[PDB]
Amino acid sequence: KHNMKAFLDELKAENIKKFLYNFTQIPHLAGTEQNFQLAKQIQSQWKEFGLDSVELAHYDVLLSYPNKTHPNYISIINEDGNEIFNTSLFEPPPPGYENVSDIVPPFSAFSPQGMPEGDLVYVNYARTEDFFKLERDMKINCSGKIVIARYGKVFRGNKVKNAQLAGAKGVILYSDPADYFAPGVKSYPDGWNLPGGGVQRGNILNLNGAGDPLTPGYPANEYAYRRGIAEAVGLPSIPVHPIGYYDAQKLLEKMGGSAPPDSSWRGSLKVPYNVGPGFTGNFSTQKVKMHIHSTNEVTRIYNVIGTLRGAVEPDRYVILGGHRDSWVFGGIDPQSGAAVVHEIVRSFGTLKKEGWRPRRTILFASWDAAEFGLLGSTEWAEENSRLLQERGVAYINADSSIEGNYTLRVDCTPLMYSLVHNLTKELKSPDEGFEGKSLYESWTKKSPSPEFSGMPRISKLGSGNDFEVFFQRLGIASGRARYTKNWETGYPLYHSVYETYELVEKFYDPMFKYHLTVAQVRGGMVFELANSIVLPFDCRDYAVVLRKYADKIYSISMKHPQEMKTYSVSFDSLFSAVKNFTEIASKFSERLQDFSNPIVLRMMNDQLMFLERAFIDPLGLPDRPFYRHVIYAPSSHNKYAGESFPGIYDALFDIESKVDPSKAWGEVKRQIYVAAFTVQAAAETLSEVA
Amino acid sequence: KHNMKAFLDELKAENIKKFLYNFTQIPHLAGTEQNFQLAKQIQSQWKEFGLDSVELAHYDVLLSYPNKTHPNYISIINEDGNEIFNTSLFEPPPPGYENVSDIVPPFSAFSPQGMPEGDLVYVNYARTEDFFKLERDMKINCSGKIVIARYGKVFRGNKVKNAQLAGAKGVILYSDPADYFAPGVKSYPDGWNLPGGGVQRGNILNLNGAGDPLTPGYPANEYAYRRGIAEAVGLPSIPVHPIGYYDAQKLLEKMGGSAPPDSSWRGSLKVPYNVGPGFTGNFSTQKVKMHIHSTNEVTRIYNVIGTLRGAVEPDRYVILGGHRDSWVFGGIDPQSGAAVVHEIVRSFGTLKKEGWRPRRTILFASWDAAEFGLLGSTEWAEENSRLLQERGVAYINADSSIEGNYTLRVDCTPLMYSLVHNLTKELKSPDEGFEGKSLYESWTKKSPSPEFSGMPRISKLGSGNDFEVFFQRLGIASGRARYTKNWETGYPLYHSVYETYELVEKFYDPMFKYHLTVAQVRGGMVFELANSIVLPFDCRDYAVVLRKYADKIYSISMKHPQEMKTYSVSFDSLFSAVKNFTEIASKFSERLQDFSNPIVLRMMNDQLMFLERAFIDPLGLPDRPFYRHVIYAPSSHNKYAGESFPGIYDALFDIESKVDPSKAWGEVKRQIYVAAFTVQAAAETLSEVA
Ligand SMILES: *[C@@H]1O[C@H](CO)[C@@H](O[C@@H]2O[C@H](CO)[C@@H](O[C@@H]3O[C@H](CO)[C@@H](O)[C@H](O[C@H]4O[C@H](CO)[C@@H](O)[C@H](O)[C@@H]4O)[C@@H]3O)[C@H](O)[C@H]2NC(C)=O)[C@H](O)[C@H]1NC(C)=O
Ligand SMILES: *[C@@H]1O[C@H](CO)[C@@H](O[C@@H]2O[C@H](CO)[C@@H](O[C@@H]3O[C@H](CO)[C@@H](O)[C@H](O[C@H]4O[C@H](CO)[C@@H](O)[C@H](O)[C@@H]4O)[C@@H]3O)[C@H](O)[C@H]2NC(C)=O)[C@H](O)[C@H]1NC(C)=O
Ligand SMILES: *[C@@H]1O[C@H](CO)[C@@H](O[C@@H]2O[C@H](CO)[C@@H](O)[C@H](O)[C@H]2NC(C)=O)[C@H](O)[C@H]1NC(C)=O
Ligand SMILES: *[C@@H]1O[C@H](CO)[C@@H](O[C@@H]2O[C@H](CO)[C@@H](O)[C@H](O)[C@H]2NC(C)=O)[C@H](O)[C@H]1NC(C)=O
Ligand SMILES: *[C@@H]1O[C@H](CO)[C@@H](O[C@@H]2O[C@H](CO)[C@@H](O)[C@H](O)[C@H]2NC(C)=O)[C@H](O)[C@H]1NC(C)=O
Ligand SMILES: *[C@@H]1O[C@H](CO)[C@@H](O[C@@H]2O[C@H](CO)[C@@H](O)[C@H](O)[C@H]2NC(C)=O)[C@H](O)[C@H]1NC(C)=O
Ligand SMILES: CSCC[C@H](NC(=O)[C@H](CC(=O)O)NC(C)=O)C(=O)O
Ligand SMILES: CSCC[C@H](NC(=O)[C@H](CC(=O)O)NC(C)=O)C(=O)O
Ligand SMILES: *[C@@H]1O[C@H](CO)[C@@H](O)[C@H](O)[C@H]1NC(C)=O
Ligand SMILES: *[C@@H]1O[C@H](CO)[C@@H](O)[C@H](O)[C@H]1NC(C)=O
Ligand SMILES: *[C@@H]1O[C@H](CO)[C@@H](O)[C@H](O)[C@H]1NC(C)=O
Ligand SMILES: *[C@@H]1O[C@H](CO)[C@@H](O)[C@H](O)[C@H]1NC(C)=O
Ligand SMILES: *[C@@H]1O[C@H](CO)[C@@H](O)[C@H](O)[C@H]1NC(C)=O
Ligand SMILES: *[C@@H]1O[C@H](CO)[C@@H](O)[C@H](O)[C@H]1NC(C)=O
Ligand SMILES: [Ca+2]
Ligand SMILES: [Ca+2]
Ligand SMILES: [Cl-]
Ligand SMILES: [Cl-]
Ligand SMILES: [Zn+2]
Ligand SMILES: [Zn+2]
Ligand SMILES: [Zn+2]
Ligand SMILES: [Zn+2]
């Protein structure tokens, strides 16, 4: 037979290992020749694996690179103007790669140029809460200051956005060992920990889903008319540079001014963690000077797009996509995902060569420039938005297959919960102690649901990966899965030069069994979405979560009972809509269970496909036109995290500080109306059609 | 058989006459009890005619009414402050209706209150060109002036918008006999001409497709959160009132200042048509005083929505809709349309009672509050936008079936051109001299196409009627048809109390043969759209017009050859996209002609259905978020008229006057890119799907 078991059995750990090795021997930075070379290899393959068509889709987008002959660095400068300490010009390369060409040194992508001189303030994680506390509680002024912040907890851009609106002037990001050095583990190359010379790269844009900063709304094709830099989307206005903890130590050791308010503000370095501003008297006259010469440049990028045409519904698309571009070698991010995609395509192609085709079309994508703002996936989705709107069944992401070796992690729409539960009950656990048990069993034991006994945790989609445009802008049901760490104990080498094939093969997954398990989950999800007669979505699972999210937003509002009395703020409409959704979804499920009348079947499959679509508001969220999903958006305080009912959540956020409470509570009421309406409208897509 | 001929043969002129009489005996102003009573009657039915379901959909929207105990009027006031002449408090009622209650007197809906005092300037038609000429050529200052404008040529709001931005202060609209008195025809009741006491009502909002001014984007349901009046959409900021030509004569006869620049500025009254400002010396010290006490009030409105469920594709909707609310009796506008809809439903229902159902679902709508800004159709579309997005095949409008008795008028998307040609070749001409000839033949002879021999004129859809939200916001293929006048020789009694059953029965259509012909066209279009196995759209007809529109926009730009050289303004991308659309549409038509594989058939029908949808830009047009169709929008200078490539057209408009030509031509280039991209993206929806 050609069934899912045949597809799954064909996947091999040894192939994924080969690929990973194949994809990680040289750097594949977006917009470079090496990454174009890899795109052409993958295109070739995907063709030989058996796909019907494999094309490159190219765009010309804004990228950012250091100047090769004028390197970025940070100095401590005395009152004479002498530079008495310099941060590193590069991370010490890993063993055997100390002659690899074109390792681009650590930098913050899209930093402007500048050489700002000043005094440090230490802002902990640079979280919204961290800046409130500094200013409101400690009455500390970030204005005119160079802010030094440790990485962690939230997306770095959000840190930079936070630093900007606090008035800083120049920004230094560093990796504190408290956050990136696991206790009792050796640093690379002898273990998977971050050494003091390692540095986390990463872009610091705040794009809010726009994609290429010069062409918001439209693909960056060969006739595109571009915004000027001054009008670009999401660019930071102050210089920014990242460093490792050896260099941070040398910068922090002199901090004066106020003590840290508490132990949650102290990292692990042997320094005071004083918030500043400025140094201590001996060195009160020394300053910190940044030197940033990176340039933004419009550069061609290339997605590989493979098609396996469906036998019965070729105009319905199930998409498996993940990025290919890396900061350096990409041993985990993204090649541990890309190698899994490659083996998935190989397996589908083996079935295809035997005469099989999926019911629906499967599209496979190798996205470019994800590291510079999800640019490749976003421009492609902009180009193809009408086809994806009307034909897109689901998107399964495929960035890193691993970020630990403890258990499964799944983030997805509630419409895929039942699919994931059923699939994982049929897969073998790769975990020690669970041999002969299901993946569902190991996962449920290690990552219990907060809400239900005997079920596993499944998280919300936010942003920070290539599902963003599909889910949050277009409203196509999306999911992702990977192996993860035990959150009761990022990953330390994230976006550093030390992310290598050896890191994975020696320390994370020597037998490639976790990679294989992830391939079975991602590939199995794609198989069911593309082959099941009835789409494998359960609308009742959305009804359950919508009640949870309504309870939670109401609870936030109920912190302000006087104002809700004064401004007649009622959530009755939203609960009514959720109750209606629950009722209608229950009746739809009954019809689905007990309706070869392929029209009632295409009808009901279209109702399932367009249900995620119904949560889109074509007006977007306030000042964020490309975040259109009314139930989920990336948190306005952390792009990585999903927020439920974001429009109401943001309207309530810090509302007690708003100067005009009448206007502010009016806006909460407006967001309640929009959310209640959207939930009712989505519910009504599941009613009998006439 | 139950085929189209059976449907058509069942339609009867005598029923349409009965319904018309039934719908026009009392006023049916939006938001009044009489119009709710009529809604309930139509609901009852439409149920007894055989529809599967018939419901009222109600909303609470902003309406505008005069104050019953403080009537609106205009005065000439002397230097003593004595009111020496007053305009009428009402139009003399027509014979036999001089005891009808609740005729609301002439007013401009949504006028603010005020009693502004000042001097007149006469602004011809108040067109954009009319104000350029006044200010730029004649150097006349409209600031602080009461503007008196004649109606005609463009939608009145656009006049009011134009007057506002010129700085006026108070506005008087009047009907000049040059525009509303047909030579050699008697005035009502002895002919169809406008008497000197007749007045054209009408709203003066500039909503740009928003619908209810308080709830843009969302239906005005029972939990809606409303904008404050100060933030409402489209409200005028200066008082406005309409008058007849007897009263205008008394206001114009004293005008001084500059002569009219030319004979296109002179109407037919026995006055100078002096542009002013102010009166002549004898009466230099007299002023004009407005007294406006109308109030805006949130008021419930009711649409009737009837469903005839499809036998095979119940989740595909073909909509026949037209409004029910009238200014007074609505003898032409809208009851000549509503009576045709009523007889269409009756005919479909007779087939239904015999066991027939259409292939697709037909929805029938009696819209409310169209006269106050297309409010009923727009709120309903907002409420149901997801269902209409994904399921809407076509919308056929049904306001007035007649505005003359000369020939057919059709305005529709190019996707319906072939449908209309084929249908009219099968219908009998009702015209004198064409007995035994086809409607296509009479129509083609009387209204030749400018472009092709042996074909009839078909116009572009703009706005000013209830197709607007469906076509211009949602991108559902739309059309309208009615009998019209000979444009080589509005209608005079438009929006006056004299629009009665007798007007129609005595003067426009005594045998109800033109009404019957229109019923056959509108009903025949609905029948084919709802029953044809393959949707009756020809994508090649769009390819033809897109080339015409590209040629025309390029020609406008080419008035500025130096600037196109300087700013490298190329239309190459748009012509390339149009060429591609032509090629792909030709190949799609081949596949359509020669593909009982119902999936290739649902696939290809979805490609046809979503082709109009592909011309929507989810970002809308600049500052007009609810006008989203990239090919057509209502003209920014006349809501009634459709404009092609509106985004580029508006970017080029009066560009020679822009202060920063670099920025302005940059914006033309941006609009070219958006249009080329949209045309290519629409083309690509017709490519093979995988
Ligand atoms: C969840 O689904 C239910 C359907 O089961 C749906 O119930 C609807 O609720 C609305 C709002 O409460 C009802 O609206 C009423 O409609 C009647 C006519 O049928 C009107 O007369 C009512 O207006 C009067 O009363 C109001 C409230 O006191 C006054 O404000 C108003 O001025 C009038 O005096 C009112 O509009 C509607 O009938 C039902 N529909 C049903 C039962 O079918 C509910 O709205 C859904 N939830 C959401 C969020 O959509
Ligand atoms: C109408 O349909 C046709 C398809 O039949 C489509 O043609 C496409 O045109 C684009 C733009 O001209 C072509 O783009 C080229 O792609 C190649 C790779 O295949 C690149 O190497 C090219 O870039 C080089 O040259 C450019 C121009 O001088 C430089 O600006 C650039 O820096 C590079 O040096 C270029 O991007 C594309 O190949 C074809 N596709 C085909 C033939 O299949 C056309 O675009 C469609 N019209 C619209 C409006 O979409
Ligand atoms: C990654 O694998 C690819 C595919 O096997 C290798 O590319 C092939 O290399 C051989 C030998 O140079 C060529 O003859 C083939 O034409 C290549 N095939 C392609 C590009 O599709 C590539 O060498 C491997 N890379 C590494 C670093 O091992
Ligand atoms: C997950 O598996 C369950 C259990 O088999 C599926 O639920 C069953 O579905 C069949 C077919 O509709 C029904 O006959 C049973 O009554 C269902 N059992 C239940 C609900 O306990 C479920 O549909 C699967 N989910 C998918 C495929 O998304
Ligand atoms: C318009 O026609 C309707 C439908 O025939 C008339 O309403 C009916 O009137 C009779 C007599 O009053 C009632 O018994 C019916 O119940 C009504 N039917 C309805 C409302 O569906 C109505 O009277 C006519 N109006 C005019 C002005 O002639
Ligand atoms: C309008 O009528 C024409 C003439 O019958 C239709 O065009 C024909 O369509 C049939 C079926 O696809 C083809 O076999 C013929 O070759 C066509 N004749 C032509 C193009 O001259 C046309 O499709 C009709 N338009 C509709 C139904 O929208
Ligand atoms: C906002 S565009 C940059 C996105 C980029 N994303 C990442 O680095 C993702 C985040 C995640 O999904 O775990 N990394 C991986 C290993 O998946 C970043 O955060 O730098
Ligand atoms: C912009 S909302 C008001 C719309 C209203 N429309 C009209 O009056 C329409 C215009 C048309 O489509 O011929 N009149 C009729 C007889 O169709 C008006 O212009 O007053
Ligand atoms: C890199 O730096 C040097 C010094 O400014 C300069 O010569 C060269 O142009 C720079 N390259 C850029 C800005 O791309
Ligand atoms: C911090 O001090 C600077 C001195 O230039 C001042 O301008 C600024 O307002 C202060 N910061 C805040 C947040 O008030
Ligand atoms: C792999 O799992 C083991 C056992 O729990 C643990 O000691 C080791 O640190 C894990 N490796 C990584 C990279 O997490
Ligand atoms: C109508 O006019 C009179 C005078 O202002 C007033 O008594 C009444 O309130 C008005 N009605 C309104 C404003 O609805
Ligand atoms: C017309 O005159 C008034 C006098 O108050 C003046 O303020 C205004 O600027 C003039 N109009 C224009 C268009 O300049
Ligand atoms: C009806 O048609 C006749 C003949 O052309 C014409 O004389 C008459 O004015 C028309 N009536 C109307 C209302 O246009
Ligand atoms: Ca873009
Ligand atoms: Ca509204
Ligand atoms: Cl992922
Ligand atoms: Cl019409
Ligand atoms: Zn990644
Ligand atoms: Zn990354
Ligand atoms: Zn009308
Ligand atoms: Zn009207």
From Swiss-Prot, chains A, B:
**MF terms per GO, please?**
Ac-Asp-Glu binding; carboxypeptidase activity; dipeptidase activity; metal ion binding; metallocarboxypeptidase activity; peptidase activity; tetrahydrofolyl-poly(glutamate) polymer binding
Residues binding Ca(2+) are 215, 218, 379, 382
- What is stated about the way this protein's activity is regulated? The NAALADase activity is inhibited by beta-NAAG, quisqualic acid, 2-(phosphonomethyl) pentanedioic acid (PMPA) and EDTA. Activated by cobalt.
Q: Entry's SUPFAM superfamilies?
A: PA domain, Transferrin receptor-like dimerisation domain, Zn-dependent exopeptidases
**Which modifications occur after translation, per UniProt?**
The first two amino acids at the N-terminus of isoform PSMA' appear to be cleaved by limited proteolysis. The N-terminus is blocked.
Q: Does the keyword S-adenosyl-L-methionine apply?
A: no
Positions with a binding annotation for substrate: 156, 203, 370, 463-465, 480-482, 494-495, 639-640
Q: How does activity depend on pH?
A: Stable at pH greater than 6.5.
The record's catalysed reaction(s) read: Release of an unsubstituted, C-terminal glutamyl residue, typically from Ac-Asp-Glu or folylpoly-gamma-glutamates
Q: Name the InterPro entries for this protein.
A: PA_dom_sf, PA_domain, Peptidase_M28, Peptidase_M28B, TFR-like_dimer_dom, TFR-like_dimer_dom_sf
Expression tissues: Highly expressed in prostate epithelium. Detected in urinary bladder, kidney, testis, ovary, fallopian tube, breast, adrenal gland, liver, esophagus, stomach, small intestine, colon and brain (at protein level). Detected in the small intestine, brain, kidney, liver, spleen, colon, trachea, spinal cord and the capillary endothelium of a variety of tumors. Expressed specifically in jejunum brush border membranes. In the brain, highly expressed in the ventral striatum and brain stem. Also expressed in fetal liver and kidney. Isoform PSMA' is the most abundant form in normal prostate.
Q: Which residues form the active site?
A: 370, 570, 606, 629
Glycosylation: residue positions: 22, 67, 86, 99, 141, 282, 405, 422, 580
Q: Taxonomically, which superkingdom? A: Eukaryota
Stated EC number for the protein is 3.4.17.21
- What induces or represses its expression, per the UniProt entry? In the prostate, up-regulated in response to androgen deprivation.
Primary place of residence? membrane
Its cellular-component GO annotations read: cell surface; cytoplasm; extracellular exosome; membrane; plasma membrane
The biological process GO terms on file are: C-terminal protein deglutamylation; folic acid-containing compound metabolic process; proteolysis
> What are the protein's UniProt keywords?
Calcium, Carboxypeptidase, Cell membrane, Cytoplasm, Dipeptidase, Glycoprotein, Hydrolase, Membrane, Metal-binding, Metalloprotease, Multifunctional enzyme, Phosphoprotein, Protease, Signal-anchor, Transmembrane, Transmembrane helix, Zinc
Phenotypic consequence of residue 282 to A: Loss of glycosylation. Reduces enzyme activity
Q: What is known of its domains?
A: The NAALADase activity is found in the central region, the dipeptidyl peptidase IV type activity in the C-terminal.
Q: What does the UniProt record say this protein does?
A: Has both folate hydrolase and N-acetylated-alpha-linked-acidic dipeptidase (NAALADase) activity. Has a preference for tri-alpha-glutamate peptides. In the intestine, required for the uptake of folate. In the brain, modulates excitatory neurotransmission through the hydrolysis of the neuropeptide, N-aceylaspartylglutamate (NAAG), thereby releasing glutamate. Involved in prostate tumor progression. Also exhibits a dipeptidyl-peptidase IV type activity. In vitro, cleaves Gly-Pro-AMC.
Q: Which family does it belong to?
A: Belongs to the peptidase M28 family. M28B subfamily.
Q: What is this protein called?
A: Glutamate carboxypeptidase 2
